[PDB]
Design a protein around this nucleic acid. Structure first.
Lengths: 129, 80, 150, 205, 82, 123
RNA sequence: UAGCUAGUAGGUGGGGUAACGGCUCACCUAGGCGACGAUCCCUAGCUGGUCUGAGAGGAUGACCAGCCACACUGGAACUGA
RNA sequence: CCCGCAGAAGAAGCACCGGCUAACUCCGUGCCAGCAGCCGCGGUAAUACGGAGGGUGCAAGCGUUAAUCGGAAUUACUGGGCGUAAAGCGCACGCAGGCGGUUUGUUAAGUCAGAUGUGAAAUCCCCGGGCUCAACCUGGGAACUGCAUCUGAUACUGGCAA
């Protein structure tokens, strides 16, 4: 059954980048809009738009720089089978800083740079490389 | 304040005493998975008010029998 | 400034009608010493003809690598056929410390001081092919910032 | 514990002048350099990758007169120090007392400098140091004692000190026969042809 | 009895004594409550040779601790400053 | 492989037991050499291989190869077994230390001399 | 090696100890432990650490130091803080 | 520890040289004698056996053996696999277990941040100091990745209510 909708979202974006898809729709939630706002903020997607009233639908307009795709490798880190909670010192950098890692901290859903600057660790959701 | 624990009554049938299962939720040292893990404790209660299936808080005291170094403070949540 | 070097020569066989027939395969890598790495295979009936076909194929089919100061940038994993290959920039982690047939491509590639560890198969014809794939899909901070705006 | 053999043989296996017989005359002229390190020395080796790494380590040890456990300890110390392990390793080999006595022109070779150091003819900072591998700190004064001053050797050695290149990190002065190790030698200040990444990679396998 | 006493720790023919506070019936180089200074009888003729925390020593003598003859000699050497 | 399956039952690599039950894993043992043989090897090789059969000091009766050209062993001759397989003979797992208790050094040998129990010739 | 346990699990009272306590005894209740591995069997002194490892780990716990246990073998108490 | 005396005078072995693996020829032997960690050498011109010359590596040591970890991603948590190489239960139902769509409120158990107590000393690591240097000894720090308590944060997971 669906047991990880975040990894489902990242699957939608990997398979949309891999199929030269212009835009990606999915069911929407607060955590997916938080992550999507981080992805737009860090420049991996072009835009997002949440529509619907009773059944919201998140839509990510994807990016393609050259013919190549911008989101090179998006991975889900803290899956439901095994959750991964890092401190502010254990908090990893991806592609030696060239690629953010979306961590859910108590202050909100941030990146690794932003939460290492904020001085607080948390639950590391996904590597975007 | 005092250090106390919470747990549920696992069995009842003993003469002014009870036994309480505690659920500690601990990460596996090698595998990094948070796993449930119990701790059954023989707990004293004067006048045996708590029955089976309850939830009760519990503090540590002097020994009262073999094992039995624990005594309740507050019975909560008895709902059958 | 061409900086060519051969990795592996082998004797393959064919098994015709009357006995066997033995041929020699070279496998070389050239590179200028600042990106610009190529490999060539080349096979012939004697060894110097084999290495010459290998060099001649390797001088063309040469790929750009976005080096750092003298080294890689981020840790990169390249795979080819059965041969999985890790590399780590080792920001002046002195000396090229790579496996055989990976030391050579990293040596003429112009990188100086990375850390490697090939896994899986370590056939020399596929461990390069897994270093270039690898160094090819390693991108620089002016390319990632080009992609994602800033 | 030290070599004690044919020296120019060691200089002939490496293919390069290891400065092992600096002495009176000029460039070798009786070595048959490059030609035959043994009976089958006329053969080109077609040397391996282990052979080039090994042969680089042997070049450096046979220059500075160090054996393997001592060299290996220098590699461990150069590894743990902050910076560049090749350059740190040459900085540890250049701070050796017999080397600093050789660089100042007090000995003709490094073995003669090692015998000056060994035979209590050398003070550092006004204290006699008997040890070939004493590690000379920067801003030190290393000199010859009153015994073994104005002995022939050192005079002749200073005579052949002017034929060489006068290292930048020293105060060579031969009037008083005292020297000052001022700073650690930069990598660009020494020899230019040894490949220390090969010996880093040799010990890192 | 707790004793503020020396405990030999240097090499052979080169002792370095660490002054500790031990339960007196332990071994010499054994179990101690706290170490409180040191005493090097050589060290060189440089700066110290001996430093020794007088506040903690005064604390333990306030508790009831005894002091061996060397530690008393060292406190009589480092009196307040010298 | 699933992390739950490893919590239920962890990984376990086997023990990889010893080729040489010289018991306690001692460097050498001593034995009595119950008999002395020559034995034909396995198929690609042919020779007569000089091999003793030994009652060790720990009870085990094991057969043991005798190195070098020519020995002086006969049936009681207390030897010092070493450890090391001769692959060409089926079932010898050990060697005898030449130059040991009742096993003389190899006669007229000049190179690799230490591993055959022979002293340096005076010259 | 899937069942183990009758002072066994708990209670009341008496005794006992420096001190709580089935520690012990009388009586009452019929519990307690166990697949989160009891019980049985083989092995083993434990730790700070040591060796190896890029690391995570793996092996080990000679010297040095902390704790425990033993003092020909089995048992017992006496004196004494 | 310092000074003086006499004279190079008292002071170099061990393994290896077919590939892996740095370092090669001659002679003796001829499926023998024997070598060998694996591949494998030896049945007449053996760079693999035995000797010599030569060389290579280490050096008051050097080899062999035993044992451990590494290499071994060949138990894979980091970090593997399962159509045909070993590997998908013959197929289902289902308890305990593991996991669980979406919104709001509360809690704050997990999680995170800070503080305090502790995590003995030595050892490892860093910056210094003393033995002529080094090993060694030593001063100060870092570390001991932990546990407990208190103070907070509430995004995610859990509890509770809708």
């Amino acid at each position: 059954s669906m047991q990880d909708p975040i990894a489902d979202m990242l699957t939608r974006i990997r398979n949309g980048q891999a199929a030269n898809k212009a835009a990606v729709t999915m069911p929407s939630s607060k955590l997916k809009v938080a992550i999507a706002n981080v992805l737009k903020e860090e420049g991996f997607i072009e835009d997002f738009k949440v529509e619907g009233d009773t059944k919201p639908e998140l839509e990510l307009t994807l990016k393609y720089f050259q013919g190549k795709a911008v989101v090179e490798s998006i991975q889900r880190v803290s899956r439901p089978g095994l959750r991964i909670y890092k401190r502010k010192d254990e908090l990893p950098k991806v592609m030696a800083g060239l690629g953010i890692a979306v961590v859910s901290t108590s202050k909100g859903v941030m990146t690794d740079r932003a939460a290492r600057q904020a001085g607080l660790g948390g639950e590391i959701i996904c590597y975007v490389a | 304040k005092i250090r106390t624990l919470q747990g549920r009554v696992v069995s009842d049938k003993m003469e002014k005493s009870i036994v309480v299962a505690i659920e500690r939720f601990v990460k596996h040292p090698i595998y990094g998975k948070f796993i449930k893990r119990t701790t059954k404790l023989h707990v004293h209660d004067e006048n045996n008010e708590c029955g089976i299936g309850d939830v009760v808080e519990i503090r540590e005291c002097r020994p009262l029998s073999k094992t039995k170094s624990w005594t309740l403070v507050r019975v909560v949540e008895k709902a059958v | 400034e061409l900086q060519e070097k051969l990795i592996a020569v082998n004797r393959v066989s064919k098994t015709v009608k009357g006995g066997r027939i033995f041929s020699f395969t070279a496998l070389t890598v050239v590179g200028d010493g600042n990106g610009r790495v190529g490999f060539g295979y080349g096979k012939a009936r004697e060894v110097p003809a084999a290495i010459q076909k290998a060099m001649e194929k390797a001088r063309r089919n040469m790929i750009n690598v976005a080096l750092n100061n003298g080294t890689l940038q981020h840790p990169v994993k390249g795979v080819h056929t059965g041969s999985r290959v890790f590399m780590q920039p080792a920001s002046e982690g002195t000396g090229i410390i790579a496996g055989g047939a990976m030391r050579a491509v990293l040596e003429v590639a112009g990188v100086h001081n990375v850390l490697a560890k090939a896994y899986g198969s370590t056939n020399p014809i596929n461990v390069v092919r897994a270093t270039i794939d690898g160094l090819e899909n390693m991108n620089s901070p002016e390319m990632v910032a080009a992609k994602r705006g800033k | 514990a030290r070599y004690l053999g044919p020296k120019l043989k060691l200089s002939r296996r490496e293919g390069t002048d290891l400065f092992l017989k600096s002495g009176v005359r000029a460039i070798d002229t009786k070595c048959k350099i490059e030609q035959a390190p043994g009976q089958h020395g006329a053969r080109k080796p077609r040397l391996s990758d282990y052979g080039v790494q090994l042969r680089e380590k042997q070049k450096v040890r046979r220059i500075y007169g160090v054996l393997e456990r001592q060299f290996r300890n220098y590699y461990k110390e150069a590894a743990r120090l902050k910076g560049n392990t090749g350059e740190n390793l040459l900085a540890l080999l250049e701070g050796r007392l017999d080397n600093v006595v050789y660089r100042m022109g007090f000995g003709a070779t490094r073995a003669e400098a090692r015998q000056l150091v060994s035979h209590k003819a050398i003070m550092v900072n006004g204290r006699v140091v008997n040890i070939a591998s004493y590690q000379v700190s920067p801003n030190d004064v290393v000199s010859i004692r009153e015994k073994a001053k104005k002995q022939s050797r050192v005079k002749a050695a200073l005579e052949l000190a002017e034929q060489r290149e006068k290292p930048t990190w020293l105060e060579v002065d031969a009037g008083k026969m005292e020297g000052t190790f001022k700073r650690k030698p930069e990598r660009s200040d020494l020899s230019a042809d040894i490949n220390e990444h090969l010996i880093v990679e040799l010990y890192s396998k | 009895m707790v004793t503020i006493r020396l405990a030999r720790h240097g090499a052979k023919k080169r002792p370095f004594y660490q002054v500790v506070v031990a339960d007196s019936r332990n071994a010499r180089n054994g179990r101690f409550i706290e170490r409180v200074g040191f005493f090097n009888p050589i060290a060189s003729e440089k700066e110290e040779g001996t430093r020794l925390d007088l506040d903690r020593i005064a604390h333990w003598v306030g508790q009831g601790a005894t002091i061996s003859d060397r530690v008393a000699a060292l406190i009589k050497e480092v009196n307040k400053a010298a | 492989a699933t992390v739950n399956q490893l919590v239920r039952k962890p990984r376990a690599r086997k023990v990889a037991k010893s080729n040489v039950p010289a018991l306690e894993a001692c460097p050498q043992k001593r034995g009595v050499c119950t008999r002395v043989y020559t034995t034909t090897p396995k198929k690609p090789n042919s020779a007569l291989r000089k091999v003793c059969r030994v009652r060790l000091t720990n009870g085990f009766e094991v057969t043991s190869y005798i190195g070098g050209e020519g020995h002086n062993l006969q049936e009681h001759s207390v030897i010092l077994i070493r450890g090391g397989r001769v692959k060409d003979l089926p079932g010898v797992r050990y060697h005898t230390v030449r130059g040991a208790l009742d096993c003389s050094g190899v006669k007229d040998r000049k190179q690799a001399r230490s591993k055959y129990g022979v002293k340096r010739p005076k010259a």
